[PDB]
Amino acid sequence: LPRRIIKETQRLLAEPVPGIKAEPDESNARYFHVVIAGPQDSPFEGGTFKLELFLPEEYPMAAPKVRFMTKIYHPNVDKLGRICLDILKDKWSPALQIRTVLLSIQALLSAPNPDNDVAEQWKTNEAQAIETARAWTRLYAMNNI
């Protein structure tokens, strides 16, 4: 277990990201259990969204793997919880950290970008898609902890 991961983990627990709880798994230190609060003034407000993040063998040369566990009605999160985020692929750099990933996912919740069927709804009728997201949040992202 590279000291880099130990440092990040120690540092993550010391200075947590506001609105984000991120803790290493008790059995496997490469796995992190993440809970992101729904951003205020968003359709996801009031919600607590669970995510699984793990660090592959080649980290930090390779990006961490992240997946939403909590069902969410978001243009950039598919039915399998997979999130479309450039820094999780070709835009990843060894200078990036778990913090940056967490911050980016958090921002993605504040700014859904439709430009899949979910994305279609956000496009054709946005006002209703927000309402669905608001319902999905109530249904799946509240009292779910």
Added chain:
Amino acid sequence: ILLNVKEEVTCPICLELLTEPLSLHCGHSFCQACISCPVCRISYQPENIQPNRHVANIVEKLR
């Protein structure tokens, strides 16, 4: 102010204090063992690399 300084001389790759720091023209530096800039992505000729003995001395006069 001391934490901010220590973070300025921290290698963004290994996340430890810079050891044999090599600097890029963009101002970012890395441990010699740890090497487009990984941080700012501004390109550099693979010879415009220059050791930073001043930073190395600052690192030592830190802890």
